[PDB]
Amino acid sequence: DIYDLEDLKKNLMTEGDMKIRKTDIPERYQELRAGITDYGNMSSEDQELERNWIAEKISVDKNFDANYDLTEFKEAIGNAIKFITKENLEVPFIYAYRRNYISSREKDGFLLTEDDLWDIVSLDIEFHSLVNKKDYVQRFYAELHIDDPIVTEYFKNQNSLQDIYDYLEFKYANEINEMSYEKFKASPLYQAVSDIGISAEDVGENISSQHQIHPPVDHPSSKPVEVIESILNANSGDLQTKLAIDTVQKYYSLELSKNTKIREKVRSDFSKYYLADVVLTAKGKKEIQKGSLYEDIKYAINRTPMHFRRDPDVFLKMVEAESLNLLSVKLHMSSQAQYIEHLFQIALETTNTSDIAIEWNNFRKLAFNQAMDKIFQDISQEVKDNLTKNCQKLVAKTVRHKFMTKLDQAPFIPNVRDPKIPKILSLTCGQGRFGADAIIAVYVNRKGDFIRDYKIVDNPFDKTNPEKFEDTLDNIIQSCQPNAIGINGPNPKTQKFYKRLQEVLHKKQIVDSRGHTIPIIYVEDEVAIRYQNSERAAQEFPNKPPLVKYCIALARYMHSPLLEYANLTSEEVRSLSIHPHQNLLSSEQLSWALETAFVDIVNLVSVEVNKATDNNYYASALKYISGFGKRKAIDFLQSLQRLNEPLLARQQLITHNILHKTIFMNSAGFLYISWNEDLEHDQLDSTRIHPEDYHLATKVAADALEYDPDTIAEKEEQGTMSEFIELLREDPDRRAKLESLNLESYAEELEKNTGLRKLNNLNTIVLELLDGFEELRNDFHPLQGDEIFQSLTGESSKDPSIWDLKQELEDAEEERKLMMAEARAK
Numbered sequence: 001d002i003y004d005l006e007d008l009k010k011n012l013m014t015e016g017d018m019k020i021r022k023t024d025i026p027e028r029y030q031e032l033r034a035g036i037t038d039y040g041n042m043s044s045e046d047q048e049l050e051r052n053w054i055a056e057k058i059s060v061d062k063n064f065d066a067n068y069d070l071t072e073f074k075e076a077i078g079n080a081i082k083f084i085t086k087e088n089l090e091v092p093f094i095y096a097y098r099r100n101y102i103s104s105r106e107k108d109g110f111l112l113t114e115d116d117l118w119d120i121v122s123l124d125i126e127f128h129s130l131v132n133k134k135d136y137v138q139r140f141y142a143e144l145h146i147d148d149p150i151v152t153e154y155f156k157n158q159n160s161l162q163d164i165y166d167y168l169e170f171k172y173a174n175e176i177n178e179m180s181y182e183k184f185k186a187s188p189l190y191q192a193v194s195d196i197g198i199s200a201e202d203v204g205e206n207i208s209s210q211h212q213i214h215p216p217v218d219h220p221s222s223k224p225v226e227v228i229e230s231i232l233n234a235n236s237g238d239l240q241t242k243l244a245i246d247t248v249q250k251y252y253s254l255e256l257s258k259n260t261k262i263r264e265k266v267r268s269d270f271s272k273y274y275l276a277d278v279v280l281t282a283k284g285k286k287e288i289q290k291g292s293l294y295e296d297i298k299y300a301i302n303r304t305p306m307h308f309r310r311d312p313d314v315f316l317k318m319v320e321a322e323s324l325n326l327l328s329v330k331l332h333m334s335s336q337a338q339y340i341e342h343l344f345q346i347a348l349e350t351t352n353t354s355d356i357a358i359e360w361n362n363f364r365k366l367a368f369n370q371a372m373d374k375i376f377q378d379i380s381q382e383v384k385d386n387l388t389k390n391c392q393k394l395v396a397k398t399v400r401h402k403f404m405t406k407l408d409q410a411p412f413i414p415n416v417r418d419p420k421i422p423k424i425l426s427l428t429c430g431q432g433r434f435g436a437d438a439i440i441a442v443y444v445n446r447k448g449d450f451i452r453d454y455k456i457v458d459n460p461f462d463k464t465n466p467e468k469f470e471d472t473l474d475n476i477i478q479s480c481q482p483n484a485i486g487i488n489g490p491n492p493k494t495q496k497f498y499k500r501l502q503e504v505l506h507k508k509q510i511v512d513s514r515g516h517t518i519p520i521i522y523v524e525d526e527v528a529i530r531y532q533n534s535e536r537a538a539q540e541f542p543n544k545p546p547l548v549k550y551c552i553a554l555a556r557y558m559h560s561p562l563l564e565y566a567n568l569t570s571e572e573v574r575s576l577s578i579h580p581h582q583n584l585l586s587s588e589q590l591s592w593a594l595e596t597a598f599v600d601i602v603n604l605v606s607v608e609v610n611k612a613t614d615n616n617y618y619a620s621a622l623k624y625i626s627g628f629g630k631r632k633a634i635d636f637l638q639s640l641q642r643l644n645e646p647l648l649a650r651q652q653l654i655t656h657n658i659l660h661k662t663i664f665m666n667s668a669g670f671l672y673i674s675w676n677e678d679l680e681h682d683q684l685d686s687t688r689i690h691p692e693d694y695h696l697a698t699k700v701a702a703d704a705l706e707y708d709p710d711t712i713a714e715k716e717e718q719g720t721m722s723e724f725i726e727l728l729r730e731d732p733d734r735r736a737k738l739e740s741l742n743l744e745s746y747a748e749e750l751e752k753n754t755g756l757r758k759l760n761n762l763n764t765i766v767l768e769l770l771d772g773f774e775e776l777r778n779d780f781h782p783l784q785g786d787e788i789f790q791s792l793t794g795e796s797s798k799d800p801s802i803w804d805l806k807q808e809l810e811d812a813e814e815e816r817k818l819m820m821a822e823a824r825a826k
């Protein structure tokens with residue numbers, strides 16, 4: 001039994017996983033919404049607030065002129081939210097096939113980038129979580145039925161939420177416990193709290209009002225101590241000495257610290273005008289030394305929300321170092337003692353001059369400070385937590401862009417004028433003990449297949465017989481005829497190897513048809529290093545040595561950087577040196593930065609269905625296709641394998657009951673079928689044109705060729721519009737006629753007659769009809785001189801107002817004195 005559910009978990013066949021496989025919503029969306037009760041049942045007012053709240057957040061980084069009218073921008077934000085939340089479409093799809101519904105009608109107004117679209121997904125979830133918490137609290141109070149003026153005012157006017165809940169928890173503890181302070185409140189001693197002359201609530205409204213609308217009422221005949229003693233004497237039985245006074249003052253403090261109006265005031269000021277200081281421990285005092293990367297924050301003081309908006313990494317440094325108990329990041333307000341005194345003046349302070357008024361003002365003043373100490377301690381932690389998260393988000397963005405630049409590398413092409421995926425000969429000289437360490441070379445063909453490897457034993461720099469190596473290389477290059485050569489290695493001997501290889505190429509005149517020496521490039525080997533020592537490489541090539549697995553990986557990286565990253569395991573991909581700060585992210589944030597980047601580029605590049613069904617390397621991209629995740633990618637390949645025949649058209653995904661409406665809409669344009677029974681093959685299945693735009697596509701072809709409306713209406717009635725694609729395909733004048741459609745006018749007329757906004761759609765329709773699935777990644781990046789160096793080598797503010805010079809000096813003097821003491825110890 002227990003072993004049955006292990007194999008289910010392994011195969012992704014648990015009940016929970018079967019629901020995910022079956023449900024017609026993108027897998028990632030199902031994962032994201034898993035913790036959200038009633039995801040689809042938000043009120044109208046809430047949906048409205050979510051659009052404005054989100055719209056504002058994205059608006060930030062756009063830097064829109066103060067004059068700028070934000071109305072069309074907010075409508076784009078609304079549209080994206082419709083697509084994500086109501087139509088369950090993913091970012092790649094929205095960006096590919098709805099760009100004009102998230103862009104400004106007017107040229108270069110605004111565009112919601114893919115970055116924006118991912119933020120909107122994340123913020124959407126997060127807004128639904130709030131609404132969840134808000135509905136939980138508001139349903140918890142409406143359930144109580146009690147009519148507390150504070151909370152009723154609250155849900156009308158509206159971390160305030162947590163405070164409201166706590167105020168109900170504190171005040172009505174007994175009344176809800178059906179559905180310590182509470183028992184003191186029943187005690188006779190609580191009379192003394194009444195005698196203080198102003199309720200916690202009144203203080204709260206004083207502070208909210210900014211003036212003392214509720215003046216305290218001093219006890220007429222008695223001081224605090226007397227009132228207490230009168231209450232003790234009149235209750236010999238129950239109560240059993242200044243401790244009593246302390247208690248009254250403690251529980252009154254407590255009532256003050258639970259007031260939402262007081263906590264709200266402090267929260268807003270503290271969160272706007274905080275400063276961060278570093279407080280060291282001995283461990284941090286000696287460890288930095290000037291060598292660690294903290295030479296500009298070892299005595300960091302008075303850091304502002306602006307300082308951390310600009311350099312958000314800085315704080316995370318602080319939080320990790322504190323989790324190392326090397327230091328502790330302290331947040332505080334500019335003039336905290338004075339900020340509190342001021343609030344006391346406005347809220348509690350009396351100018352009555354009698355002894356009785358004096359002792360009561362002192363008593364209230366103490367209770368108020370005790371309460372403000374608690375509030376500040378809480379708010380200090382909230383602002384810290386939210387600053388951490390806020391900085392983790394800024395870093396997540398850059399980690400995602402860095403990883404995307406790695407992924408956004410087109411297959412290396414040796415001759416840009418005649419783009420052809422090259423036959424590859426990749427080499428490594430390993431340790432580089434020339435004449436002792438064999439040189440390893442591998443030959444991988446255009447389709448990505450490994451053909452064979454070589455083991456050159458001729459010493460490249462043989463003094464007596466140099467020509468031996470030259471000739472062997474010539475032989476290999478005549479047998480394989482590569483179009484490009486890729487290399488890399490552990491040390492600078494790899495460089496000498498490269499220089500040499502250039503000489504041998506020119507001497508033997510190994511060239512292109514164009515007479516240019518075949519290009520040699522250094523190849524990023526961060527994947528190759530992890531592959532050569534992997535179970536899957538040992539499994540894929542059971543009886544080859546490390547450096548052969550390493551060279552196969554070099555070639556494969558040249559062919560598709562994307563597929564190389566996409567074929568690492570979670571463990572292997574997370575261990576890459578992607579960004580120096582990536583370890584400051586939570587595993588969940590890191591996973592999201594990587595996954596969104598995968599999804600962006602995997603859908604840009606697409607996946608040929610047939611080639612994935614029976615090739616696991618290539619099928620590794622499937623899980624990142626719009627609509628798919630890890631469970632749907634499997635279920636889908638299994639559906640295809642059961643089919644025992646190749647897929648002939650996109651539409652078969654639905655006729656065969658492989659995909660339903662939604663996952664089909666999400667994915668169909670990113671899943672293609674290569675073009676070259678007869679009536680069963682659609683040519684548009686080899687383009688980035690989506691099935692829903694097929695009718696538009698054939699119309700573009702018909703107009704390109706200048707066909708009559710009688711002829712078009714005729715085919716339109718017949719149901720043979722598809723015939724126009726072949727007609728454009730036969731026609732030899734097709735490129736010039738396509739290129740001559742004025743696409744702006746065409747989108748104008750189209751919208752005018754149908755209301756559809758399809759300009760961007762029409763653009764990639766004409767480009768895809770010219771040449772299906774042209775390559776759209778940015779260029780392959782051969783390692784440049786600097787990176788070569790680092791690869792083979794390993795080598796790569798003290799202003800008194802923001803820097804604690806005094807502490808630095810005193811710590812330096814105590815350290816020196818420390819060294820003197822350590823010396824003496826002999």
